[model samples]
Structure formats: C-alpha cells, structure tokens
Target: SQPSTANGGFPSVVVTAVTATTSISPDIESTWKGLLAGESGIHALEDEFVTKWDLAVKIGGHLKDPVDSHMGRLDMRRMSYVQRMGKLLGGQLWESAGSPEVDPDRFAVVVGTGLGGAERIVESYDLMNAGGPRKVSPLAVQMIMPNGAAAVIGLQLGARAGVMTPVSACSSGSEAIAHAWRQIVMGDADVAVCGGVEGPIEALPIAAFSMMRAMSTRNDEPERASRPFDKDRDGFVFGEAGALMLIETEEHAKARGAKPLARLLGAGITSDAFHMVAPAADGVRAGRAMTRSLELAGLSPADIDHVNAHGTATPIGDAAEANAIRVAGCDQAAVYAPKSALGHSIGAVGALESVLTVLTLRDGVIPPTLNYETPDPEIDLDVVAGEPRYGDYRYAVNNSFGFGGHNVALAFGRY
Candidate 1:
C-alpha cells in the first residue's frame, strides 16, 4: 500500500472511479436503467437452445451494444466473445490511464470466468457432432482453455507483469479484483488490469438452465422477468458481459500522481461447504464473510451507508443474503441489486454491481431493484425498491457468492 492523490480520475470517475472502468455486456446501465428502478430484465428464449423446453421461467436480459461497428473487430480471425471482452476491457484499462507506455514487466492483467468459452465449446461440439472427425478447429484448445480471457488480454495489452486468471465460479471477477489488489499490495507490479467475463448462454447452457427452470418465462414482458426478493422469483437469470479494473499500489499511484477514485479497503472470503448450489440455510458462513469484511476494513456497520447486495433472485440466495446482512449488524443500510437490471452476469456480477455501487456513492443515490414486489417475510431489511434513493456514503459493501459454495465480501470507500 502507498500514499494516494485525489483519484486515478473521470466519470465512469472517468465511468465510476479507479475500482474499474468496466461493464456487464450491453452496458447494464442504459438498457437496464428502468429495471434498476426495480423492473425485470428476464424474458423468454428466442434462441435455438430452448425451442423444446417446457420452461415456466424463460426470461433473460440481452445486451444492446452501441453501433454494431467493427472498431473492435481487429484481427477477427482468432477472437471469441470471451477473448474479445477481455482484450477490449484490457485495452480500456490502458486507454483510460492515458494509454501508458508498454512495459511488459510493470503491468499485469488478471481475468476470471466460471465456464470458459462454453459458447466456443458448444460451437466446436456442434461441428464435431454434425460434421464428424476432423471437423473441430485446431484453435479449439486455445479457445476452450480456462485462462483464455487473461491470456488474450495479456496479448492485447502487451502486459508481461504477470498474466494470471482465477476460476472461482461466481466469485471469479471479485476474486480477480482481489488478486489485482494484492499484486499491488505485495509490490509485484506498478499497474495491473483485472476483471471477469462469460461466454456462455448459447444453446447448451440455455437448454440446460431452462431445463432446470432457472430462467423466467415472461417473454410477454422481457424487462419484467429477472425479479429479485420478489416472493414470486423462480431462479437466477444468466447473462453475459465483461468488467475491468486498473489497480496500483497507493505508493505507486501517489508517485505517478495517479489519484484514486476509491480505496480497496478490505475483502472477506469464506466457504460454506454446506451446499453445492444452495447457500447455508442459516446464513452462518455467509454472515461471517459480511462481518469479517467490515472488520478487515477497520470500519463499523454504521459507516456503511449503502450495500450492493448479491441478490441473485434465487429463492435461497436472496433470503440467505438478507439473513447474512442482518447478522453482519447492518440491517439498516440501504440495499439494492443491479441484477434487477442486468440480470446476474455470472462472474462479472460482483464487479459490475460494485461499479454500480461506486456510482451510487458518486451521484449520492442508490438505484432500486426493479420488480421487487411481494416482499419475502423471511427477509427483513431496507431493500431499496420503488425508485432510486438519495444518500451520502463514505463507505459501501459489495457482496458476491459463487457456485461450489464460494463467497466473497468486499468493503469499499470514497476518500
């Protein structure tokens, strides 16, 4: 850790502070703003994957990128969705920092994912299944490798500081951010790029999830599907996207005169081997992670004015998080979930939602979780609904839970 200046700088604090100049595919802010106001982005599957499933819930939020332009299509022959997102965001880290000089040993990149290149895997599988032997491309190995996102981003940024990737289910992105923060804390690199992305959501994933009845079948109103905390919520809505963070030690940032938009106060990681998919019924471990994060950050629950809840809309997940927040003793803090808008972007959930929380701190408001009606009696908290709420925050907490019973709690602050 080192001394700091004002902020590493911009609105996003050039888009939402030094935490990360990031996204959740389709820029969850615009398309999902209404949902952020507490609506649903869940909709029916229009793709080929779920034409046969009798899904009671079949909704999802799709990204609407600005201008389908080819600006990002350079050397398109070897790029996959995960690769494209990783490299593009890595480039953004470079560009945002005034495009710093390429020093292979000084800049590193960290990326994470749960299912690496599932889309590509499915593509190759489809080809092999239909076209027989020799149908699979030689690049299959490169594309399907779990670290593809980090490697592709490293290649793009010319970053040789150390290209590493973490594969911690839903906590992947938050873990990647934690890794980047540690790289700076341990004095490993001057600047590091970190984030997460997902390339799944095509045929196989869609069909599999639909079969599990994980998606909302509200195609009649696509934006009203992925409902969180609503008594009627069926399950999580899987979406795709990428997010990036530029991390530097406080000393390096101050030495380089890089102002910090926010500080990585502390992080709490806990595992609840209690269940493979469902969270701890009593939220004991989940609550420990929440309380531990605040303790590590040297702050009290009262200091936290807002909470970026890891509201995945799953019956168990939403309730468990509420119980954990209560156990953390921050039962009164304002809480909201962007998944209401962006619909759970897997590994990127923590990052994107953290970014949204940073925005709440910057603009002095917390956006409501869309479509949060019929409150669950088991959960009692100030779950901000109806509309965005105004508040001044010096500290905020962002939470994320991953499959395999992984959990992470990050405490952040504005200086």
Candidate 2:
C-alpha cells in the first residue's frame, strides 16, 4: 500500500498572510493584543438609526475607526460598507504577504458574507420611496449585489482564475477559506485570497434580532454582555468586521520565500438538516463534522490541543456546541470563545476567529475568553478565561455553525 497522506495526496495549503479590520482595532496586532488582554470591543449604540427607531437593543461591537476614512469621496460613493471593508482587508493581506508576485491567471478571490450590502439595499429602497425610481443611484445594483466584496477584490487584484462568494450566514467566512483550500488543492489555482466581511449594524437587523430575543439586552453593561458559556448568558451581541488571509500551496509559498503562519491541514463541511436557525440538540451532525475534519487531516482527537469554539453566548448554542465537542472526543482540548470579547459578527466572525486561531498556534498562547464569570455545568470544558494561556500546542480546530444547519470545522497545525 502507498504511504498515508494527511492531505489526501493534494499539495498542502498554507496561510501566509492574515489581516482583519475588527471592532477592537483595525490593525491586526492591536486586535490580538486587546484579545490577549481580555478587552471587550462592545459598546452602546447611539447612532441616528438607533435613536430614530428606538431600537430595543442599543449595544453592539462597532468598529473603532471608520472604514471610509482612508478612501476618497469617489471610491466611497461607489462601494458599499461591506465591499469597502473587504477591499481594505484584501489590500492589507497582500501587503502583509510582501505583495507577492503571482500570475494573474493563477490567482483567485473568495469573500463570503451573510447579508452582503444589506444596508445599501435598505438605503436604495428608502431613496425610491422618498423620491422616485429615477432618484436611485446608478451604482445601487452593484452595491447591493451579494458578490460585491468578492468582485471588488477580484478586480483589485486582477484575479482571472475565479471569484466566488458563499452566503452561509455565520459560517460564510470559514466556508470561504475552505473554498480557497479546495481550489489550490485541486490544481484549479496556485494562490487565493479569501475571507469574510459583514456590516449589518442597521435598524432592521437589530430590530429583527431583538424581536426574536436572539441578542443580548444588557444595554447598560455592554462590555459584560457577551458572556459565552456563562450561567447568566442570555444571548449574543451583534458586531461588524472583516478578515482575510492569503493562502497558497506549500510548494508555491516556499518558491516565493513566503513564511507560513500555519498549515491549513483539512476542513469538513456538514449539515444538520434539523432546523433553520436552531442547532440540533443532539450535536451528532456537528460532531461528525469535527471528526471528519480530523480524519481528513490524518489526525486523531488526541492530536488536537485547542478549539476556537463558536461560542456566541446564546444558551442553546453554547450547550449544543459543548455536546458536539464532547461527541467529537475533544472535551480535553482547551477552548477559547472569541465571541465573548469581539461579539458575534455573523459571517465575518468565522474568518476572524480562524485568524485568531492561527495567531494562537503561531505564538503558542491562547487568548482569554472574557466575561466567563460563572460557568454552566452542562457545558463542562476547560475554557481559558481572565488570562491568556501560554503552551506549546501543535494542532487546533476552529468551528463555525450558521443558520440553515451549516456546520464547518477547520483543522490547523503549527508551521
């Protein structure tokens, strides 16, 4: 028999450069420092939209710096908020990777979003209603398209291989990375820029989530609101952010002298088919996703030392994920919940967390999970809290589950 290959005989994919524009900070280094320091980015929302509608939930994770601050007036007019964030992140990622020189035909771009250009759509509707159809801007269609972010990045980098967008709610970002991994592994492309972006801090989504009772109502204490796996956890806090990574085959990276942050060992995508928005309580399907990822990476549960959980702070979500982690035989792994500090950015959260996981492995330190004062007995796991944990870990798993039963598990190893 032939030798066992961890990556199914395909060329291994490696992450070379990672960057993110998050609520805590636009700079990746600052974001990592804030997370390691257990700092929360959430704050009370007092925008005109919040006051106009009198939104019930008035707290969220808003970006510290404005996205359009660096762009010209013309560029700002043409691109939506999500697209702008994606372009900024994509540019930063390329620059961080030493602005690699690659064949235009061999480059690809994939940017995922749950509700892409939703704010633009709402604005267009308002414009039409207030004035007339003729009053709508000519760029409305381009700005409202779900593929806006991917198209912007593709055009910016002149990628001719392909441009793709995945809209799997909260898992969109992880799915984007998984897509890029497949592209490079199957010889479809040698290099890919992929990630997720989201900017939905508007009146409609906030009101809708508030009505569903799916968001935290601790408006008076925004910093302590998103407490994942805590006994007093009520729900999640909505946030906005964009994160991207430059991924290429191991051979391609070495040819260019690129330093790999981590190995994109394997990824597994599964569906629950149980509910639209609620996770299956049994956690069987989600657990299968984790195990399948390990199998694809040729690693067992014992090899995994850390888990970047999709701990959104919601009661049912945390409980279900805990059960799934147990079923996947990763109960002993040290878990860190990023949503506890960054808040839930829906589509972008997965990519943001994946980048954090890469940092964790690269630095051999696990960031603390904020606001985990009282733990839930049902979710009995070693959650790093209050302080960062420094250890020499080899393998880690990042889990992302979204609405419509989409479950994705990505395995990463230190380079």
Candidate 3:
C-alpha cells in the first residue's frame, strides 16, 4: 500500500544506499578518496591494443579490473560485456543497500547505458571476419540490445514492478535515476534500484570519437588530459564505470528502520530541441533545467550551495554550462567537476556523479577538482581545488547534459 500525503502530492523519496565500480577504484568510498587525493584514473592504453587498433590518443580511464573476476563462473562466452557489468555491479549495489527486504512485486529496476554492449557487436564482426556467420556468439542478438543491462538486472533481482533503460547519450544514467524516482512518486513501486553502466572503451567507439575530434589526444599525459573548466583543456577522455543507487519513500524507509544516505529532493529534465549534438549556445534551455530542478525541489537558487557540474572539459560544452550556471544564479556555488579526475564515463558518468553529489552532502566535504590550476576566464566560478573543503551543505545539484540536447538536473538535500 502507498502512503497518502496530507497535501495529496507524492511521498518524499530518499536515497538509502549507493555503490559503484569505476576505473579509479572498486567502490564509491575509494573513488571519493581518490578524488580528494587528486588522483586521475585515466592511463595510457596498452601497447598491444594501441598497435592493434592503430589508434590516435592512446590513453583513457579504462577499468583496472577485468570482467573475469567480477563475473565469477559466468561464461563471458555467453554473456555480453554490458550484461556482465550490470549483473556484477548491480548485485554489489543491492547488497550495499542491504538487499532491501521488500516484496518482489513492489520492486523496480532501471539501468542505463549509452552504447549498450557495443563491444559485443564489435566482437561479432570480428568473429564473422575470422570464422564466418556461424562463428558469431549465439547470444549476439541479446548482447547488442540497448536495454541489455537493465534487462539483466531485472531478472537478477526478480523485479516485477518494472524494468527500464533510458538512453540519452551521457544523460542516460541520471535520466535512469530520474525515471525510477518517477515510478515511486507515481505510487507504482515502493522500492527502486537505478543507475548507469557502460563498457564503450573498444576500438569502434574510440575510432568514432576520434573521428569526431571529441576526445583528448594527450597521449603523453593521460592523467592531466581531462581538465574540466581549465583554460587549456582539449577534450574529454572515454572511461568506463557502473553506478547505482537505491530509492524509496522516506516513510517506507523509516518503516523498515533504514537510514537514508541522502534525500532525493527532485529532478528536472528538458531538451534543447534545437540541435542534435551541440548544446544551445544561449544557455536558456539548460538554465531552465536547473531552475526547474530547484522549482521541483521547492527550493530557491540560493539554497544550492554546491553544484556537481557536467563539466566534460570540451571547450564549447564547458562554456555553455558555465553560462547556464550563471544564468541559473549558481555562479557563486562551489562547483566540483568529477570528470576532471574520472574522465568521461559516457552514460555512467551522470549516475556516478549523482552518487558523488549525495556523498558530498552526506560527508559535508567537497572533493577537489584535479588539474584546475588555470580556469577559463569566461567560466568564472568557485571551483573546488587543492584539498577537500568541509561545509554545512543543505542542498546540492548534479547536472547532466547529453547529445541530442537532453539535459537533466538532480537535486539532493542533506538528510
């Protein structure tokens, strides 16, 4: 049964737990520590891979651990890369969330990925080249689907309420979180597990991005490549990660005596409807997304003391976001760009950064943005740098903007 709010509005939802696997570290806490320590997860590509692909920009924030250990006993021969990541990482997230003793019928799941099982498709092509049509994996159709991660998670958890996968380029993860929140708000589900995952570090993605001139070619200094908001930042580096969070009503959580990690105040989603890849230069649409987020949270712009910016380090993207922040009256907010250290994890970056934002308010410490020595003159803001800064944060916002002009803003209130 759903709780009825006195005002007839939806019940308040809170984040009960979070867990993530990223290139920099195994779990969320370690990733936070790495951010505070100014460590970059990006590294030079293995010589074998570089030579085999004949690639440019031979560095990325690739996962340190391979799928072999994470998917113990699971035949990689049968499962796609994204499916393995979703199952392994999503299970960790469920366990971290105490497995939320909930009715299977009342639970839901959402996992987003930008290029779901891209590597699986690449492998299929290679198999055909080497051994003809019969050489392709039998599960090739299942592997290439965009909802592979969410589908796997739903079956793994037996979530009968719903299972969803939101794909909007880099905004995919945050959008997934927003969708799960919608389910609970609409009284459709009592508990939701949601996040984003990606495994797009393969040759095809690398080649496509390189062709677009959207990636940094700083082969010699991978650590310093993704310098978000910095004057000399070239572009973002492709990275891989999986980030998930558990969401339920405050009343439901309290009924179970579960401690909330943070409050999911609200989220606002919008599209520029003007461009396919480039963000609207006027910043009007993105600014509206931020303002709408505050509006949905019943908050004023002044209440946002910190911003987890979608600062991907691309020249145009950074400037547009900066203008949007100022337009949304958050120019003075302490902005921490995680991509400066984590690189761009595509669809997973949004969810990973959302978790980081919740933890930031929970811990009362803002992690430093690496390689922020020189800021872009036009992008003036209070960027967190040097060391972790402690403060009493009442609210914070995490922003995600993707290709196709998708923009989402997630608000978190300290609990």
Candidate 4:
C-alpha cells in the first residue's frame, strides 16, 4: 500500500523520500538484490477457476501481508476505514519528511484515481439497502467522490494550494504523480504530496471485475494467482492498497536539510486513442510516450536497469504492455512484478507499483513475480520468477497503463 522514502533533513537544494511509522519491508532487501541482478517478478496462479465464473485462465499473485495485521480498533474507526493502509503511510510521511515550512498556498495536492471513495460507494449502497435513503449520511456523496482522499489530506494538513484529482482509469495514480512532478518542476508549489490510494475490497467490486473478466478466480491458493507474462495466467485479482508520496522542491528540501530517498528523473505519459478498455497495440502512442520519456529524462532504454511493469496478468492488457515495453527502448529491461504478491487495486495500482520500483532501487534486490510457471507467448520478455534476486541498479522505470487508453511511465533512480 505504501512506497519508498527515507525521512529526515539533508543539505541545500534537496527533495527527499522518507518514512517513520512505516519501516521498510524486509522483502525489500531481497527484492532489491534481485533487480540489480536483472530479474523479473513474474509468478503464477493455478489454471483452474475456483468460482463458477466463465473466465479464461485462472490464477494470480495475492499478497501474504494480511490487511489488518497492525491497526487497532480505535485507529480504524477515526481514519478512513478504506484507506487505512494508505493513511498509515500518509501519516508516516506527514510525521517524517512532510513540511510545515512551506506556505499553505505553496503546498499543493494532486491525487489520481478512477474511484477514490469506492468503499464508501458500496457502503452507501449497503446502508440504503438496510436503512433506506433518508437514513444515509449527508456526507455520503462527498465521501464517495474520486477526490475524497486528496481533500481529506489537504484538510488534515491545512494545505491551501490546489488539490486536483486525476480520474483517468488505471493510470490515475501515475498521472497524479506525473502531475505533481510537473507542478514542482514548474514551481507551482515548493512541496507537494502526490500519489493515489485505493481502499476498496469488497464483493460488488469483485462482481464488477468478474463482469470485465479481468479478475482471477483462483481464491483458495491466493498467492500464486497473479502470473504475468505467463501462459497459464488468468486475470488480475481485485486487491486493495494505497501509496502516498511526499514531494518537495529540490531547493526547498535542501533549504530544510532533507536527504531524498530517490529522485523522480522524469515521467512519460500518453494514451492509445484506440480503445476504451484495450490497448491500441499499434504501439504508436504508447511507444511514443516511452520514447518521449527517454527524451525527457535525458536517458535511454539501456540506462533503465528495471521496468516495474503494470502486469495485471490480463490477457490482452498484459500482452499489449509487453509489446509496449518492447516498443519503448526498455524492451529488455528487468521489470518488477510485485502485483503478483498484491492484488490489483485499480486506481492505486500505478502508484503502489511505482513504489515497488522505487523501493527495489532503494533497497537493492528485485521482488519476484510469483506465478510465472509458463510464460505467455505474447509477453516475450524476461520476468524474474521463483525467488528474489540481487543486481542493485541506479535507475528503473515503472510502467502503468490504464483502461480508456491511458499510459504512464515513471523513472526512478538510486537517490
């Protein structure tokens, strides 16, 4: 649910990533070593669907990290119950590297999401079903909108700068981060906390995902379900998680003596003007976006040691992304597959996976893709499978493509 950061202040002109209540994952050490060694995170789910849904392949990688392993009853009640995972990390950022130095007008918020308050949506439905419309809370609509998280964060922090929410399907988080990067780069704000978080895990979403046939049905043996670039894979599992990042201007971070965990070298984004739900596959738009990122970042595909892929294990979507990577110069990039561990949390996947890529670079090894038993013929690339590996590279790119033709690529380095 959270991404990378090393809290505290450093020298002049710094932008840092930090955490406090959030300790770095031990899996990160192993995951970090794996990427430097040039590995993939592709694993597998079984080939049979547990549910009666007529979905195709049946498998996916579900996270072993239990959702409620830490929080107590009181904390869960006051916080956005859905964004518990995200808010934990968010609070950590606030306590660690977050600043009260910047003027409220100079501190902005931009969060991306196809749907931010989805759990609230389902909850509202349940409330209505049980207690009728009049009984619904007056805050129901505000709580269910896509910008609730950003708004809540702004209110919590008293941020007076703009709070924008990008809702362009799956690329929401990627785009939000990209948007924040641009804002700071262009001097719209000195510090910005950007990213997306999803706390929606329920039957209605699962049912809707089942309708798209984009979710895996491998329920019993949940861990081995998310197999990207694998032939025996089904679709992504509807998982829930969130990632919140603290962004500060280089000069501002430095002024406060902050040491950055990693630097956002550049971000590339484009859309396949081709489909509402499928990739354009012509690889033109997506390819151009990748190339543009290379141009913007002032680096080449060979410069990128890791490519944290948005591999949800969906049939066409997974294949299209592989082709897009190939189309991008990082065709042979060592991609991370943490989604094989955490289920797909839609709007938050991009940000969450971006965290996977950044932390892999930060900690040293690459996390393995859990369910890659048989590689997909269409997904022709090297995905690290089985166990974690170690390579320790200086730079990596996280690829996030969304429905409605959204594509985003974030470049991270060993800052």
- lDDT by residue for model 3 over 1-415, one digit each (tens)? 3232223366788999898887888878888888788788889887477798789879887775665576655457667777888888778877877776688788899888888877677789998999999998677887789888888888888889999999999999999998898888887898898999888477777887778777888888889888889999888887778888989889889998889988887788988998888888777788888987777677789999999999988888899899889888888799999998888888898999999999999999998888888978888989998898898888999999998999999988899
Candidates' lDDT values, in order?
Answer: 0.68, 0.88, 0.85, 0.66
Question: Can you rank all candidates by TM-score, best first?
Answer: 2, 3, 1, 4
After best superposition, candidate 3 residue 173: deviation in angstroms? 0.3
**Model 2 — which ten-residue stretch has the worst lDDT?**
1-10
- Please tell me which predicted candidate would have the highest lDDT against the true structure: 2
The lDDT of model 3 is 0.85
In candidate 3, where is summed lDDT lowest over 10 consecutive residues?
Answer: 1-10
On a 0 to 100 scale, what is the lDDT of residue 25 in model 4?
Answer: 36
Off by over 4 Å in 4: 1-15, 18-87, 98-100, 119-136
Task: Show where candidate 2 strays beyond 4 Å.
Answer: 1-8, 126-134
What is the alpha-carbon lDDT of model 2 when measured against the actual structure? 0.88
**Model 1 lDDT per residue over 1-415, tens place:** 4222222321011112232222233443453355444544455556554556554545665544421233354534466677766765666666656665645787778788877766676788899999886998777787878888899888877887888888777888877876666565556776777778775455556566566555556567766666788888877776555677676656656655656667666667888998766788777787787777776667778788888888887788888888888878787888887777777777766667666665666667777777788888888778788877877778888888887778788777775
TM-score for every candidate vs. truth?
A: 0.85, 0.96, 0.94, 0.80
Candidate with the larger lDDT of 1 and 3: 3
lDDT of 4 at 320: 81
At residue 264, give the lDDT of candidate 1. Answer: 69
